Amino acid sequence: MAKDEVKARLAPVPVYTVANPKNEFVLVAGENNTQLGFFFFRKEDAEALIEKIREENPRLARDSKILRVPMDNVYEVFTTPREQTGLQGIHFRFMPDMKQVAHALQLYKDAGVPTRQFIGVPVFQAEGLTVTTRDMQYVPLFLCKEDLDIAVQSAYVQRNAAPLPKVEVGSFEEVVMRMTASAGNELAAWSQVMFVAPELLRDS
Amino acid sequence: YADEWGFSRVGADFPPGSHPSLFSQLLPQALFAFDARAAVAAVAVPLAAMAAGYGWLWYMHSIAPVWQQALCAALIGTGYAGLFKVAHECAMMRFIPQMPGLQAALGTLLMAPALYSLPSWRLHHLHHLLHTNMLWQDVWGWHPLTKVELADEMVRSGGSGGAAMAAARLVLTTPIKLFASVGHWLRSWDGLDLRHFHPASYVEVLSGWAAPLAFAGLVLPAVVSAGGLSGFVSCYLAPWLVFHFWLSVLSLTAHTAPHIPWRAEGDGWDAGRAAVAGTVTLRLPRPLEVLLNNANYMLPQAVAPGLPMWSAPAAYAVLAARLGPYLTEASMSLKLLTNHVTRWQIYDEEAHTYRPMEEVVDEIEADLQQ
């Protein structure tokens, strides 16, 4: 796709960072360069980084706040080479939820693989689960296993009836790179993508 | 022996009939000048200390330890006590006599954070100067609890209990005695009553009351609105308490000792015998004297109420070289504070014997009604 289409499709996914009051970035620097943005999908991990910053430099933790940013601005940050901007070395990695990494490893275990290793943020999808919009049929990519389970169970109990729809989990970085670099029939396959937020089918 | 209480150089005896302004001729006219550098330093150095403390406070608000916060608050309070000394000089019309309007504006602006009034302050301190060490009349000062009044609230109120026998037993037996300038500040509002004052000064008294009221109605809601109770105790209340501690300590060490008597008028009270014999000069380390703006040297200001603040230690050196045995000095130490707290509490009006509260209560208790 174009970056406008990718940003439009990535809008309903929020992520959380740690920011200084003038919308800076608490970029844990570790050792030589290696600054890491650590875009946290879960707010508990962001608060854990806040606790680490509090234990290390207590002046910074009071200034810093958990900034919520939609994935379109995150994609805009990720795309541009940082040498052109003049601030290079900041890695800007993604931090997945540990519970959903464990769920992804469990779903890996079904076929039988090294089920104690994963790459990137897991994205869950059932082979056969479709969302019926106005006259087009989008394919939901579920950021959460519990949301996928609710949708799968509700859909098969509503359409009647065996009814285990495969349930496959991939990496969120690759489903963004394929969206960017897709041109042929993959473009039409990705044009029907739909992104479920990590807390969308909650107790409502 | 009078260094048994840290009262170092003590005074022997002063003849009566003398007036304190009489000794102004002992001070040469070079001290009664205007040093613009000294005035700017006297305003700026305590303001620099206050600015440094507040910059520290905005550096580390709550990540700081309690003792670090206390030290920073003590620095801010000492700086504001120096600024309040500058405002007291402005009230006494001896800081910038060339510009009375700027003098009054500066004094009011520097007394507004203390919730004090410049006209009421100069009125009460002129009353204290005219009635120095005089019983039942000075009020604005460390008037001691006399055994007659303790006897009144000891027998006329019944037994040993009473509201003024518990409040006094809480104040003048405990280190809260070193914060009684809060009670003096509450007394200084005169009940917000204009009928105490001359009808020709109503607008001045109202404006002098309104400027601290403007402070407490504008700046203090901004302080609570920018930090809550945690941002109000550490930013205003602790410096306020430190400044009131300094005011209480200076006022308590000025005119209270076992060798200084308190006599009512007509009994033998005299202005010289109460001023240049009834004043103990507190001595502090030089950074503390600079930060407090020489507020412990009140004797030359008493004997010459036009002598500027920066010439006060030099004029006190002149007066100590001239008068000799009549002056009393005392270094600042724990000995003076523990004596003022635990020993010198009740003033019998018989041999100026400041005594512990109980020992006198014992007399009016196991006797009188018994």
XYZ file of C-alpha atoms in Angstrom:
574
model
C 0.000 0.000 0.000
C 0.734 3.671 0.252
C 1.734 5.036 3.641
C -1.610 6.869 3.826
C -3.493 3.575 3.442
C -1.228 1.800 5.949
C -1.651 4.629 8.480
C -5.423 4.604 7.931
C -5.599 0.847 8.524
C -3.309 1.005 11.582
C -5.351 3.726 13.323
C -7.480 1.662 15.829
C -4.367 0.145 17.476
C -3.063 2.273 20.386
C 0.383 1.986 21.941
C 1.935 3.544 25.039
C 5.330 5.209 25.476
C 7.079 7.143 28.240
C 7.599 10.827 27.474
C 9.211 13.822 29.131
C 6.811 16.806 29.529
C 7.824 18.416 26.221
C 6.826 15.224 24.336
C 10.310 13.741 24.488
C 11.166 10.059 24.770
C 12.514 8.196 27.788
C 15.047 6.381 25.639
C 16.785 3.867 27.889
C 20.299 4.094 26.559
C 22.024 1.194 28.333
C 25.570 1.195 26.965
C 27.196 2.557 23.739
C 24.376 4.154 21.684
C 21.573 1.476 21.662
C 18.752 3.844 22.586
C 15.468 1.906 22.723
C 12.039 3.519 22.432
C 10.137 0.441 23.702
C 6.644 1.160 22.398
C 4.616 -0.694 25.040
C 1.396 -2.362 23.913
C 0.409 -2.796 27.580
C 0.349 0.003 30.153
C 1.611 -2.273 32.951
C 4.983 -2.649 31.217
C 5.120 1.137 30.748
C 4.527 1.595 34.479
C 7.264 -0.989 35.114
C 9.673 1.123 33.051
C 8.457 4.137 35.052
C 9.364 2.252 38.248
C 12.826 1.438 36.866
C 13.369 5.097 35.913
C 12.174 6.079 39.402
C 14.686 3.758 41.061
C 17.508 4.983 38.802
C 16.987 8.753 38.331
C 14.106 10.004 40.524
C 14.076 13.435 38.841
C 13.075 11.938 35.480
C 10.164 9.771 36.667
C 8.218 12.722 38.076
C 8.639 14.639 34.808
C 7.796 11.676 32.569
C 4.240 10.597 31.744
C 2.719 7.656 29.881
C 1.891 9.018 26.425
C -0.785 7.264 24.378
C -0.134 7.342 20.639
C -2.055 5.668 17.792
C -0.104 3.342 15.539
C -0.213 5.730 12.556
C 2.119 8.239 14.228
C 4.195 5.289 15.462
C 4.465 4.072 11.871
C 5.456 7.593 10.788
C 8.198 7.509 13.440
C 9.348 4.016 12.399
C 9.489 4.589 8.634
C 11.819 7.587 8.323
C 15.567 6.818 8.425
C 16.931 8.570 11.477
C 20.159 9.715 9.813
C 18.090 12.024 7.587
C 16.429 13.522 10.667
C 19.859 13.819 12.295
C 18.992 11.874 15.481
C 20.162 8.344 14.797
C 20.804 5.328 16.998
C 17.389 5.242 18.677
C 16.259 1.707 17.934
C 12.463 2.030 18.492
C 11.586 -1.580 19.256
C 8.208 -3.085 20.153
C 7.430 -4.722 23.490
C 4.749 -7.443 23.362
C 2.586 -8.616 26.226
C 4.108 -11.531 28.132
C 0.724 -13.260 28.480
C 0.105 -13.080 24.735
C 3.667 -14.183 23.985
C 2.895 -17.216 26.170
C -0.363 -17.739 24.253
C 1.566 -17.482 20.968
C 4.057 -20.082 22.219
C 1.169 -22.359 23.225
C -0.336 -22.007 19.742
C 3.098 -22.694 18.251
C 3.203 -25.910 20.317
C 0.174 -27.291 18.401
C 2.268 -28.089 15.323
C 5.468 -28.717 17.299
C 8.327 -26.204 17.055
C 10.834 -24.533 19.447
C 7.895 -23.243 21.501
C 10.071 -21.162 23.877
C 11.024 -18.533 21.279
C 9.095 -15.834 19.423
C 9.820 -12.816 17.219
C 7.966 -9.519 17.463
C 4.484 -8.713 18.724
C 2.035 -11.619 18.254
C -1.044 -11.094 16.085
C -3.781 -13.729 16.224
C -6.215 -14.711 13.477
C -8.619 -17.611 12.931
C -8.715 -19.162 9.455
C -12.352 -18.499 8.582
C -13.243 -15.537 10.828
C -14.597 -12.597 8.810
C -16.323 -9.331 9.716
C -19.310 -8.416 7.548
C -19.348 -4.652 6.964
C -21.807 -2.733 4.741
C -21.072 -4.607 1.480
C -17.457 -5.744 1.971
C -16.027 -8.559 4.092
C -12.993 -7.557 6.142
C -10.564 -10.033 7.708
C -9.970 -9.134 11.390
C -6.441 -9.404 12.734
C -6.797 -9.888 16.487
C -4.142 -8.356 18.705
C -5.539 -10.387 21.607
C -6.120 -14.120 22.065
C -9.000 -13.522 24.468
C -10.733 -11.235 21.961
C -10.177 -13.829 19.226
C -11.625 -16.534 21.496
C -14.708 -14.415 22.228
C -15.245 -13.705 18.528
C -14.698 -17.339 17.471
C -16.940 -18.816 20.170
C -19.692 -16.239 19.636
C -19.570 -16.609 15.845
C -19.806 -20.398 15.824
C -22.473 -20.439 18.560
C -24.447 -17.897 16.500
C -24.090 -19.582 13.096
C -24.422 -23.122 14.628
C -21.652 -25.777 14.560
C -15.330 -29.560 13.936
C -15.779 -25.774 14.665
C -12.121 -25.108 15.680
C -10.892 -22.514 13.087
C -7.162 -23.336 13.044
C -6.110 -20.205 15.025
C -2.747 -18.975 13.717
C -0.429 -16.360 15.217
C 2.161 -14.263 13.393
C 4.397 -11.255 14.068
C 3.069 -7.695 13.989
C 6.224 -6.305 12.361
C 5.838 -8.668 9.404
C 2.128 -7.892 8.939
C 3.193 -4.242 8.651
C 6.095 -4.881 6.258
C 3.859 -7.028 4.029
C 1.213 -4.285 4.097
C 3.836 -1.767 2.988
C 5.485 -3.887 0.279
C 2.381 -5.675 -1.062
C 1.572 -4.809 -4.676
C -0.174 -7.639 -6.534
C -2.934 -9.899 -5.245
C -1.360 -9.440 -1.805
C -2.511 -5.812 -2.043
C -6.120 -6.958 -2.470
C -5.653 -9.495 0.333
C -4.342 -6.813 2.706
C -6.961 -4.241 1.660
C -9.498 -6.303 3.638
C -7.424 -6.246 6.828
C -9.035 -5.013 10.036
C -7.184 -4.451 13.297
C -8.863 -5.315 16.591
C -7.590 -3.300 19.549
C -6.148 -5.324 22.474
C -9.199 -4.437 24.614
C -12.211 -4.212 22.298
C -14.343 -7.278 23.082
C -14.078 -6.865 26.843
C -16.752 -7.427 29.503
C -19.391 -5.225 27.855
C 28.890 34.157 87.783
C 26.524 34.774 84.876
C 28.131 32.653 82.146
C 26.415 29.731 83.916
C 23.631 30.279 81.353
C 25.637 31.311 78.289
C 25.055 34.998 79.096
C 28.839 35.579 78.581
C 29.433 39.274 79.085
C 26.871 40.374 81.712
C 26.082 43.886 82.932
C 26.633 45.028 86.501
C 24.279 47.957 87.239
C 22.995 51.087 85.484
C 22.125 54.425 87.115
C 18.604 55.752 86.479
C 17.503 59.036 84.939
C 18.972 58.353 81.488
C 17.345 58.210 78.061
C 18.603 55.821 75.340
C 18.718 58.491 72.606
C 21.136 60.252 74.983
C 23.786 57.764 73.878
C 23.362 58.593 70.170
C 26.027 61.286 70.631
C 28.476 58.452 71.342
C 27.982 57.303 67.734
C 29.850 59.343 65.091
C 27.902 60.699 62.134
C 29.736 58.437 59.654
C 27.503 55.514 60.664
C 24.311 57.516 59.975
C 24.909 57.509 56.213
C 23.506 55.878 53.076
C 25.639 53.113 51.576
C 23.823 52.070 48.401
C 26.051 49.004 48.032
C 25.207 47.935 51.589
C 21.476 48.484 50.996
C 21.543 46.478 47.751
C 23.534 43.716 49.476
C 21.094 43.696 52.413
C 18.167 43.188 50.044
C 19.936 40.841 47.621
C 21.827 38.332 49.810
C 18.744 37.023 51.702
C 16.819 37.182 48.418
C 19.628 35.159 46.823
C 19.337 32.592 49.630
C 15.551 32.416 49.175
C 15.946 32.053 45.398
C 18.548 29.299 45.857
C 16.263 27.435 48.257
C 13.264 27.718 45.954
C 15.326 26.642 42.943
C 16.376 23.612 44.960
C 12.710 22.979 45.813
C 11.735 23.022 42.141
C 14.737 20.770 41.473
C 13.713 18.041 43.958
C 10.108 18.338 45.168
C 9.194 15.007 46.792
C 12.091 12.752 45.733
C 14.121 14.574 48.404
C 14.538 13.326 51.983
C 12.773 14.956 54.913
C 16.003 16.346 56.386
C 17.056 17.812 53.022
C 13.628 19.457 52.740
C 14.005 20.764 56.304
C 17.444 22.248 55.577
C 16.163 23.934 52.409
C 13.129 25.278 54.296
C 15.425 26.594 57.042
C 17.497 28.404 54.405
C 14.368 29.947 52.845
C 13.038 30.991 56.255
C 16.339 32.591 57.267
C 16.433 34.509 53.984
C 12.902 35.740 54.542
C 13.813 36.711 58.109
C 16.556 38.890 56.636
C 14.054 40.367 54.176
C 11.653 40.960 57.080
C 14.459 42.783 58.897
C 14.784 44.961 55.781
C 11.021 45.570 55.924
C 11.309 46.407 59.642
C 13.950 49.018 58.795
C 11.584 50.358 56.123
C 8.823 50.529 58.748
C 11.165 52.438 61.067
C 11.836 54.980 58.250
C 15.584 54.350 58.278
C 16.337 52.213 55.197
C 15.910 54.711 52.332
C 14.903 58.069 53.888
C 15.430 59.783 50.513
C 12.450 57.941 48.957
C 9.661 57.446 51.535
C 7.275 56.108 48.885
C 9.697 53.415 47.737
C 10.539 52.709 51.390
C 6.873 52.132 52.251
C 6.200 50.083 49.105
C 9.264 47.909 49.757
C 8.345 47.392 53.412
C 4.750 46.467 52.589
C 5.821 44.131 49.771
C 8.409 42.435 52.000
C 5.987 42.100 54.937
C 3.086 40.749 52.861
C 4.556 37.170 52.711
C 4.759 37.152 56.530
C 1.045 38.097 56.766
C 2.136 41.197 58.690
C 1.038 44.821 58.414
C 3.594 47.611 58.062
C 1.598 50.352 59.907
C 0.451 47.963 62.640
C 4.009 46.623 62.952
C 5.587 50.059 63.302
C 2.823 51.099 65.726
C 3.299 48.054 67.966
C 7.087 48.281 67.844
C 7.012 52.000 68.677
C 4.780 51.044 71.615
C 7.328 48.390 72.630
C 10.183 50.901 72.321
C 8.350 53.463 74.457
C 7.391 50.806 77.039
C 10.508 48.613 77.013
C 10.690 46.148 79.945
C 7.681 47.798 81.594
C 5.098 45.617 83.292
C 1.423 45.365 82.247
C 1.799 47.778 79.342
C 4.284 46.680 76.688
C 2.214 43.656 75.481
C 4.027 43.603 72.102
C 7.007 41.754 73.490
C 7.987 38.820 75.648
C 5.895 39.839 78.631
C 6.475 37.065 81.185
C 3.841 35.106 83.062
C 3.950 36.661 86.522
C 3.245 34.493 89.591
C 0.383 36.859 90.452
C -1.422 35.989 87.216
C -0.516 32.308 87.528
C -1.967 32.597 91.046
C -5.120 34.186 89.590
C -5.638 31.386 87.074
C -4.560 29.026 89.875
C -7.052 29.968 92.630
C -9.643 32.223 90.929
C -10.165 29.446 88.363
C -10.317 26.798 91.106
C -7.659 24.101 91.336
C -4.580 23.566 89.171
C -6.670 23.106 86.024
C -7.917 25.753 83.650
C -7.818 26.813 80.023
C -5.049 29.348 80.682
C -3.349 26.898 83.064
C -3.173 24.252 80.325
C -2.372 26.609 77.430
C 0.400 28.261 79.445
C 1.666 24.857 80.640
C 1.786 23.831 76.974
C 3.435 27.001 75.626
C 5.900 28.179 78.283
C 7.293 24.757 79.193
C 7.920 23.263 75.725
C 9.955 24.170 72.600
C 6.696 25.548 71.078
C 7.735 28.547 73.218
C 10.289 29.146 70.430
C 7.348 29.643 68.018
C 5.237 32.059 70.114
C 5.670 34.737 67.442
C 2.745 32.962 65.752
C 0.669 34.010 68.758
C 2.168 37.494 68.517
C 1.191 37.568 64.825
C -2.373 36.546 65.684
C -2.430 39.294 68.317
C -1.020 41.816 65.814
C -4.227 41.927 63.744
C -5.919 43.810 66.649
C -9.039 41.716 66.075
C -9.312 43.489 62.697
C -10.772 46.323 64.786
C -10.406 49.922 63.616
C -11.642 51.345 66.938
C -8.206 50.704 68.459
C -6.746 53.215 66.002
C -6.908 56.935 65.381
C -9.778 57.859 63.013
C -7.321 59.878 60.894
C -5.334 56.726 59.989
C -8.203 54.416 58.996
C -7.230 54.248 55.318
C -3.580 53.514 56.194
C -4.523 50.809 58.663
C -6.991 49.277 56.189
C -4.406 49.232 53.384
C -1.786 47.803 55.738
C -4.224 45.040 56.640
C -5.272 44.528 53.017
C -1.809 43.886 51.575
C -1.241 40.698 53.665
C -4.895 39.901 52.964
C -4.144 40.354 49.259
C -1.195 37.974 49.688
C -3.243 35.335 51.530
C -6.091 35.650 49.028
C -3.994 35.578 45.850
C -0.569 33.954 46.298
C -1.586 31.271 48.810
C -4.452 29.886 46.634
C -1.897 29.778 43.816
C 0.452 27.779 46.063
C -2.236 25.274 47.093
C -3.362 25.179 43.439
C 0.215 24.267 42.397
C 1.064 21.351 44.657
C -1.692 20.802 47.201
C -0.892 20.305 50.873
C 2.496 18.744 50.083
C 3.274 21.746 47.879
C 2.075 24.146 50.588
C 3.778 22.813 53.724
C 7.196 22.523 52.068
C 6.951 25.795 50.107
C 5.289 28.278 52.485
C 4.441 26.775 55.879
C 7.886 25.437 56.797
C 9.686 28.706 55.796
C 6.960 30.586 57.691
C 7.618 28.480 60.797
C 11.389 28.943 60.445
C 10.972 32.726 60.166
C 8.681 32.710 63.202
C 11.279 30.640 65.073
C 13.905 33.273 64.267
C 11.599 36.113 65.336
C 10.698 34.303 68.574
C 14.342 33.511 69.372
C 15.520 37.086 68.752
C 12.638 38.598 70.741
C 13.055 36.103 73.599
C 16.817 36.593 73.868
C 16.562 40.393 73.588
C 14.718 41.229 76.820
C 14.531 38.160 79.074
C 17.103 37.056 81.641
C 17.434 36.368 85.383
C 19.500 39.543 85.836
C 17.043 41.746 83.932
C 14.010 42.823 85.987
C 10.559 43.862 84.811
C 9.185 46.807 86.801
C 5.931 48.693 86.331
C 5.904 52.469 85.968
C 6.336 54.409 89.193
C 8.013 51.411 90.851
C 11.458 52.390 89.561
C 11.200 51.666 85.852
C 13.486 53.815 83.714
C 14.161 54.036 79.990
C 17.949 53.782 80.229
C 17.811 51.053 82.885
C 15.448 49.107 80.607
C 17.217 49.709 77.267
C 20.993 49.876 77.764
C 20.808 47.560 80.768
C 17.832 45.362 79.914
C 18.967 44.227 76.476
C 20.937 41.063 75.765
C 22.689 41.196 72.405
C 22.534 37.816 70.701
C 25.732 36.891 68.871
C 25.582 34.683 65.780
C 28.151 33.399 63.270
C 28.919 35.889 60.510
C 27.026 34.086 57.668
C 23.988 33.981 59.970
C 24.408 37.681 60.789
C 24.615 38.527 57.080
C 21.625 36.315 56.208
C 19.578 37.707 59.113
C 20.642 41.223 58.020
C 22.090 42.056 61.472
C 18.717 41.599 63.170
C 20.392 40.517 66.423
C 21.835 44.041 66.854
C 18.777 45.903 68.126
C 20.489 47.873 70.918
C 22.092 50.577 68.683
C 18.812 50.853 66.772
C 17.070 51.389 70.113
C 19.542 54.072 71.232
C 19.535 55.772 67.804
C 16.381 55.280 65.722
C 17.864 56.757 62.558
C 20.957 54.596 62.435
C 20.804 52.327 59.360
C 20.951 48.553 59.586
C 24.333 48.011 57.908
C 26.120 50.224 60.458
C 24.610 48.376 63.456
C 27.577 46.041 64.264
C 30.042 48.942 63.981
C 27.849 51.139 66.186
C 27.505 48.274 68.667
C 31.299 47.967 68.718
C 31.424 51.702 69.486
C 28.824 51.320 72.253
C 30.604 48.307 73.771
C 33.880 50.237 73.749
C 32.198 53.279 75.333
C 29.641 52.032 77.880
C 31.594 48.996 79.098
C 30.150 47.089 82.124
C 26.493 48.023 81.380
C 25.891 45.792 78.337
C 24.905 42.132 78.149
C 25.964 39.735 75.387
C 25.138 36.094 74.733
C 26.359 33.692 72.073
C 23.764 31.576 70.288
C 23.884 28.029 71.651
C 21.773 25.173 72.961
C 22.406 26.405 76.522
C 20.361 29.589 76.067
C 17.522 27.710 74.365
C 17.332 24.953 76.981
C 17.459 27.548 79.772
C 14.676 29.615 78.177
C 12.613 26.455 77.652
C 13.105 24.530 80.905
C 14.293 27.071 83.509
C 13.133 30.651 82.829
C 9.368 30.334 82.617
C 7.657 32.214 85.478
C 8.622 35.723 86.619
C 7.918 36.394 90.260
C 7.637 40.099 90.713
C 9.827 40.065 93.831
C 13.491 39.422 92.910
C 13.333 38.943 89.087
C 13.670 35.209 89.648
C 12.584 33.426 86.462
C 11.761 29.919 87.738
C 10.288 26.645 86.457
C 6.505 26.580 86.192
C 5.908 23.822 88.761
C 8.178 25.286 91.511
C 6.113 28.516 91.492
C 2.791 26.647 91.060
C 3.819 24.632 94.158
C 3.942 27.886 96.142
C 0.582 29.221 94.957
C -0.812 25.640 95.071
C 0.183 24.058 98.391
C -0.286 27.516 99.911
C -2.855 30.282 99.214
C -5.913 27.987 99.092
C -4.078 25.739 101.579
